[PDB]
Amino acid sequence: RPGGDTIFGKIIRKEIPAKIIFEDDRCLAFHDISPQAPTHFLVIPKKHISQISVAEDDDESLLGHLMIVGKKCAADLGLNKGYRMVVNEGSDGGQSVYHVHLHVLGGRQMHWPPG
Amino acid sequence: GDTIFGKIIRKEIPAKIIFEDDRCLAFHDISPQAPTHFLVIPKKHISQISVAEDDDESLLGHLMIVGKKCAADLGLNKGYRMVVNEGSDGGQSVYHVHLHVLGGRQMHWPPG
Numbered sequence: 212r213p214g215g216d217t218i219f220g221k222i223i224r225k226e227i228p229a230k231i232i233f234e235d236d237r238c239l240a241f242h243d244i245s246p247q248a249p250t251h252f253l254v255i256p257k258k259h260i261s262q263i264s265v266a267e268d269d270d271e272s273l274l275g276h277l278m279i280v281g282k283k284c285a286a287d288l289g290l291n292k293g294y295r296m297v298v299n300e301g302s303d304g305g306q307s308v309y310h311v312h313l314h315v316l317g318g319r320q321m322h323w324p325p326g
Numbered sequence: 327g328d329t330i331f332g333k334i335i336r337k338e339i340p341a342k343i344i345f346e347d348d349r350c351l352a353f354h355d356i357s358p359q360a361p362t363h364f365l366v367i368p369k370k371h372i373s374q375i376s377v378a379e380d381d382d383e384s385l386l387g388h389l390m391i392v393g394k395k396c397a398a399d400l401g402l403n404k405g406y407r408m409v410v411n412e413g414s415d416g417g418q419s420v421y422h423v424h425l426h427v428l429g430g431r432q433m434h435w436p437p438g
């Protein structure tokens with residue numbers, strides 16, 4: 212299925228509702244359902260890639276496009292003071308949905324270490 | 327507008343370099359927050375992700391592919407976290423774009 216059958220594939224195909232911020236031919240940006248900050252959204256590719264550890268060398272442009280879209284959405288949402296971009300990989304990374312996604316958190320002071 | 331990461335790229339100060347190519351450098355972080363904590367930075371000086379242009383997409387994605395390849399070579403088979411901090415709220419320390427890659431322990435949520 213185009214986009215796959217994880218909850219993110221369903222959101223890509225408009226089968227499950229989501230709060231969409233931006234959409235193009237390569238990616239979708241939408242608000243996280245359990246926000247860990249005043250502003251917390253996700254940017255996902257439309258192409259299904261299960262995890263960053265299995266991304267191909269030709270996925271570089273797409274992965275960079277997730278970050279460019281994440282920084283554009285953050286500026287459009289008024290995050291003028293900054294934000295944190297996060298990609299979780301596997302069990303130690305805390306990954307719970309196996310479809311690559313970039314978290315963007317802002318609206319508050321983010322702390323160190325990042326988890 | 328030089329930065330300490332510019333001195334590392336230029337080999338003017340020591341760093342434990344993990345990998346280098348013609349457009350990026352990966353090296354262990356001097357103040358590690360996990361058993362394995364390294365950075366991947368572009369050689370081109372982009373001060374922060376908020377000012378990166380559309381033409382930089384391939385270079386930014388290259389940081390993540392190099393980061394995931396370095397993590398595999400460093401034995402992070404149980405997973406890891408990749409982080410990019412922007413500005414004061416993001417907790418950005420050096421004004422040279424850097425991708426943090428942290429593993430070797432359970433990463434917690436929220437991510438700071």
Ligand SMILES: CNc1nc(N)nc2c1ncn2[C@@H]1O[C@H](COP(=O)(O)O)[C@@H](O)[C@@]1(C)F
Nearest residue numbers: 244245298299304305306307308309312435
């Ligand atoms: C109702 N859904 C959720 N509710 C609550 N409370 N926490 C959730 C939900 N989904 C995920 N998480 C948390 O997000 C983290 C990052 O996951 P990923 O985005 O990188 O895949 C996970 O480790 C989690 C389970 F702590």
Ligand code: NA
Nearest residue numbers: 328329332422
């Ligand atoms: Na610099």
